[PDB]
């Protein structure tokens, strides 16, 4: 179910493993179940810590 939801979100009609990883890591409980499990061809979630980006003061400064 979660996979199909992500699938519709990316406009793809066929489930691929990427979707499964996206489903698992976005639900807390499943992530707990599979916290030490690697899904092949899965990758990880997009996530950058806020601190290492550049500051939002990137605009007119005069």
């Amino acid at each position: 179910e979660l996979a199909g939801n992500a699938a519709r979100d990316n406009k793809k009609t066929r489930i691929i493993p990427r979707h499964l990883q996206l489903a698992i890591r976005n639900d807390e409980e499943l992530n707990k179940l599979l916290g030490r499990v690697t899904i092949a061809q899965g990758g990880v979630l997009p996530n950058i810590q806020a601190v290492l980006l550049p500051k939002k003061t990137e605009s007119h400064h005069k």
């Binding site: 493993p17 030490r36 499990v37 690697t38 899904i39 092949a40 061809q41 990880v44 290492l52």
Partner: protein, 82 residues
């Protein structure tokens, strides 16, 4: 010329992996340490794998041996059978 073959794990590939891990900036010294760490992991796995391999009196390493050896180290793997 070949270079102990660990150097096949090149700098830019490691940089790419670190990019997947959320890393933005990498020191020059990381590479050697990473290589060593990688080696250790592989060694352990393959040892166990080969042990399973030796038990069946086979000469061909199969995926299942790797999967089991991975399972026993607490890094269970999905997507290659069993």
């Amino acid at each position: 010329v070949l270079r102990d073959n660990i150097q096949g794990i090149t700098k830019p590939a490691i940089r790419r992996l670190a990019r997947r891990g959320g890393v933005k900036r990498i020191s020059g010294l990381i590479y050697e340490e990473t290589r060593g760490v990688l080696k250790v992991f592989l060694e352990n796995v393959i040892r166990d794998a080969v042990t399973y391999t030796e038990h069946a009196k086979r000469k061909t390493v199969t995926a299942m041996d790797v999967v089991y050896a991975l399972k026993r180290q607490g890094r269970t793997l999905y997507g290659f059978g069993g």
